[PDB]
Amino acid sequence: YEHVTVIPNTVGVPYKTLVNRPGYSPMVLEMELLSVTLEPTLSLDYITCEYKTVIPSPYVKCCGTAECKDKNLPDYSCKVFTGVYPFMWGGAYCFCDAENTQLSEAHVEKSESCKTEFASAYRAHTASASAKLRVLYQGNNITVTAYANGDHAVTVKDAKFIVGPMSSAWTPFDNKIVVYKGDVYNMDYPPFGAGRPGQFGDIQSRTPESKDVYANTQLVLQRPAAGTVHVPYSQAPSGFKYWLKERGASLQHTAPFGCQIATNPVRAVNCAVGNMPISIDIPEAAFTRVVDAPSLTDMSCEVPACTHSSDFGGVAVIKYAASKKGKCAVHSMTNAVTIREAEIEVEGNSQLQISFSTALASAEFRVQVCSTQVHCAAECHPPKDHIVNYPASHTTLGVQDISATAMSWVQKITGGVGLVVAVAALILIVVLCVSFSRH
Amino acid sequence: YEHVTVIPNTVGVPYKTLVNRPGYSPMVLEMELLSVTLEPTLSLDYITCEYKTVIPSPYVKCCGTAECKDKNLPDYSCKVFTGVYPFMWGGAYCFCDAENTQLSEAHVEKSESCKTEFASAYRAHTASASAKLRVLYQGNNITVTAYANGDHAVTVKDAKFIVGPMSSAWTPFDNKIVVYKGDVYNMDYPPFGAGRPGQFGDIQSRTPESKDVYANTQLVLQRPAAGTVHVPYSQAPSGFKYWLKERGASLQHTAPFGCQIATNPVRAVNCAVGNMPISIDIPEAAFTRVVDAPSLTDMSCEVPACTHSSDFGGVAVIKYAASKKGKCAVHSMTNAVTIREAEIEVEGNSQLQISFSTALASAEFRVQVCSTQVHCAAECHPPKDHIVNYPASHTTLGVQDISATAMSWVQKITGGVGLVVAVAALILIVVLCVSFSRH
Ligand SMILES: *[C@@H]1O[C@H](CO[C@@H]2O[C@@H](C)[C@@H](O)[C@@H](O)[C@@H]2O)[C@@H](O[C@H]2O[C@H](CO)[C@@H](O[C@H]3O[C@H](CO)[C@@H](O)[C@H](O)[C@@H]3O)[C@H](O)[C@H]2NC(C)=O)[C@H](O)[C@H]1NC(C)=O
Ligand SMILES: *[C@@H]1O[C@H](CO[C@@H]2O[C@@H](C)[C@@H](O)[C@@H](O)[C@@H]2O)[C@@H](O[C@H]2O[C@H](CO)[C@@H](O)[C@H](O)[C@H]2NC(C)=O)[C@H](O)[C@H]1NC(C)=O
Ligand SMILES: CC(C)CCC[C@@H](C)[C@H]1CC[C@H]2[C@@H]3CC=C4C[C@@H](O)CC[C@]4(C)[C@H]3CC[C@]12C
Ligand SMILES: CC(C)CCC[C@@H](C)[C@H]1CC[C@H]2[C@@H]3CC=C4C[C@@H](O)CC[C@]4(C)[C@H]3CC[C@]12C
DSSP: OEEEEEEEOOTTOOEEEEEOOTTBOOEEEEEEEEEEEEEEEEEEEEEEOOEEEEOOOOEEESSBOOOOOOOOSTTOEEEEEESOOOEETTEESOSOOSSBEEEEEEEEEEOGGGGTSOEEEEEEEEEEEEEEEEEEETTEEEEEEEETTSOBEEESSSOEEEEOOOSOOOOSSOSEEEEETTEEEOOOOOOTTOOOTTSTTSEEESSTTOSOEEEOOOOEEOOOOTTOOOOOEEOOOOHHHHHHHTOOSOHHHHOGGGOEEETTTTEEEOOOOSEEEEEEEOOGGGOOBTTTSOOEEEEEEEEEEOBOOSSSOEEEEEEEEESSSEEEEOEESSSSEEESOSEEEEOSEEEEEEEEEEOOSBOOEEEESSSSEEEEOOBOBOOSOSOOSSOOSSOOOOTTTSOOGGGHHHHHHHHHHHHHHHHHHHHHHHHHHHHTTOO | OEEEEEEESOSSOEEEEEEOOTTBOOEEEEEEEEEEEEEEEEEEEEEEOOEEEEOOOOEEETTSOOOOOOOOSSSEEEEEEESOOOEETTEESOSOSSSOEEEEEEEEEEOGGGGTSOEEEEEEEEEEEEEEEEEEETTEEEEEEEESSSOOOEEETTEEEEEOOOSOOOOSOOSEEEESSSOEEOOOOOOBTOOOTTSTTSEEESSTTOSOEEEOOOOEEOOOOTTOOOOOEEOOOOHHHHHHHTOOSOHHHHOSTTOEEETTTTEEESOOOSEEEEEEEOOGGGOOBTTTSOOOEEEEEEEEEOBOSTTTOEEEEEEEEOOSOEEEEEEESSSSEEESOSEEEEOTTOEEEEEEEEOOSEEEEEEEETTEEEEEEEEOBOOSOSOOSSOOOSSOOOOTTOOOSOOHHHHHHHHHHHHHHHHHHHHHHHHHHHHTTOO
16 A cells, blocks of 8 residues: 655654555554755865965075076066175175175965865755654654655665655755865855955865965065065965954854754755655555454543643543454544544553644544544643743644634624624615515 | 957857957957867766576475575575475485475575676766867967866966856756766666666666665576476566667767767767857957057958858958058958958068858958958859868858848839839829818
8 A cells, every 4th residue: 555645844743644545444654754964966166275485595696696587386476686785693694795686586385284274165066865764653663764855765664665855955055165174154255266365265276185276365575674684575364264263153053944064074954944755655464454453432532631732731531432452543633633642552441541732722623543533622721831942743723723612702793793784685675675666 | 458258159160259459459369169078967876787596406305394584685585395206317316205395495686797787877966067268369279278167267378268157058968867888878767776677777786886785576486397306487587688788879879969978977078059158368468559560551352252152162362551561460340251360461562362251142241450441342152062071160141131242123123112102192192282272
């Protein structure tokens, strides 16, 4: 028997479904999502990290003019200065003083620290959904793990579970993300080969091991102080360090729908978005015939207490006469009331107790004990507490559902007004009938 | 100077773009795409290959019943047969002629050959385009390689090149593809864990090295007969072998737009789809001031011959006064006529010769040389060869807004009829004016 249902993607909230296969006793299954993961496919664009400025010892020509040569280093610059007469601790550097000249050069390389401290710029495309499902099958607890794309069949204890496709393709991740350690950010990082000084991605390489490095630090060489050999320069501070200090809140703190974000691999966990279709192939061995099941008659329902605390605080007691000892599945006949118990053992002449959760002001509902149905009713009270640390177990009710039996006031008022109209209409009709009888 | 142009997404076809920077001699750049690659991102779902059936020696219990134990092998069956009386070359094997039973078992496992001969079922998501562009920068041929997603800018000869984004995201690959060798197929392979006998995917594993194997071969053990000891069985033939024989044409031969398909990794190559925006950053050193450039005077154009066919069948000759010796760019002022040469040299009072390609039955175009223009026109002949093995070089085909010479017949007929209407209208107007002058 193939049974198809749809449940909300909310994690930690169980749902029950009734399987109706004529000739067999009704079966009730319970399903709960323990974990839902959306894992994006990423493609690395570049790695950015703190740059290291390299300045070799300056060259001083004691008498004569030095010349610069071009180099292919990422941001190489060279300049020759004249009219320089530097001093050493023991006296003047050299004798000739008229044309003593100096050559200064510098370039930029990625730091050796980039091996452990770096940020990765990724592009995201699509995501593969998967989930860990728990099902109460035949009175046992089975775990089913599958990809939620509708194309993955998993067999547990002779049942074929099909999960997905997902009703929604929404993700907390943007098309362009940056990942640092455990912190994922949705940032529009600059294009490769065209970074800016003082900004994220000022120095870039395609991979950590690459020798091909792009950098834009706007490094400018300056004239040395007279009497000295130091090499002054103007350079933008690393944009990597600024970014680390100004990162702001991470995605795991800002994401919608309570999404949890983790790295290595990058994934979103337990996002409360949309719903998930589930199809179960149930073997005939799992079914009990109606002739095998107990027959329950002479039943009645009492409800000694009801509070809409969303904690299954409602209690109902049903008296029954069983034809024989055995077990029957129990299921609510309304969406307004959820019953915690999936199955109940019945024997002889006795009563069973069940717990339920509802947001109804008046808990008027039908319950199916085995193959027969009882009717329950109660006046429910509000909770004293305002806030709880758990999600409600009951469903959302409409305006027509939340109404109490006290709504009879509405019927009395509406009927009164409707009667006034009906009478006035009759009076006009009678007068018109007479009016056209005499003219 | 920032210059932006757009070219058709074609391969092996040059395009000309005119760069107009006031105060400088006009620059003409020749661009050609040498290769365009669209590379899909794939995620492996499963591997399917040829299954092997293994049948261990049968166990014979001459005086008693053999028992059966189940196994967790990918596809396992076991059965006990009674009333067997097996024979060997030297005579009957079993002494007892009663209570003689035989235990038969068989299982399916992946063949050793699956490490080499297999088909991979992939899920396709998105694709990243890239291209190899030839640019005639400063008259030189330079190679520019970049991604075509409006990113990964590169610098060649101090010029920056940005390619894309592509005008179309169309791909020859469907969401589900199967790869065997150099042949990629758009086949809707069955879901993992639910393959069918006699069909592709009858045996499945997530990876070639995995010990987790799914199989569905409908293997059934049969009873032995005639005193033999063989173990007969019924099993569907591998769906892999059937698929290989019935593969049909691969995507390499069936894909639209002339797309070429390559594998390891999978690529779509040189698809003639949409267009490709190109942005070039041109260094100031690349421009020559109009004061330094040659300026031509007293120019005239003649056209010795014209053929409205491919491969620049037309020829034109332009006379000029060089003034200062030097070189300049040549560009067509119409889209109807394409000039093959990008630039010419000017000296003395010599003429220049260029070739052109047009679909015009009667050529009529202007040519700009060294910032000045001449008017060229000719009657063009048709080609004799109906079919060629190369694409047309001219911009387009004839349209309602373009016609041959000697079309004065159209003007004469139109004018004659229009005159008849104009006269008839005047006659009626004058008569009416008189009629309305009465009373
Ligand atoms: C299937 O298993 C759940 C138990 O919880 C699950 O399994 C565990 C191992 C873990 O994976 C969890 O993430 C799962 O939710 C069971 O659910 C109920 O049984 C609990 C007792 O085993 C019950 O807790 C009770 O005891 C604690 C004190 O220890 C009290 O505070 C509680 O009030 C309660 O009396 C728990 O509350 C139950 N959960 C629900 C949602 O009703 C299922 O019964 C089990 N199925 C079977 C029949 O084995
Ligand atoms: C710059 O490029 C010219 C075109 O290059 C040709 O086509 C390219 C796609 C590539 O295959 C290259 O190897 C080819 O040479 C080229 O000039 C040539 O152009 C024609 C084809 O249009 C070619 O058959 C012929 O050999 C060349 N003709 C010349 C030399 O005028 C050449 O590489 C170079 N020309 C210049 C401007 O220096
Ligand atoms: C004496 C008479 C007028 C009492 C009437 C009480 C009525 C007007 C009140 C009491 C409870 C209220 C409902 C409570 C729940 C909901 C669900 C909400 O999503 C829409 C409004 C709706 C449906 C409310 C409509 C108004 C409501 C029905
Ligand atoms: C008086 C006689 C000679 C008029 C003949 C006009 C013919 C030769 C010319 C005039 C307009 C031309 C058309 C103009 C536009 C188009 C639409 C284009 O998508 C295909 C070519 C086509 C269809 C041209 C074909 C040739 C054409 C039809």
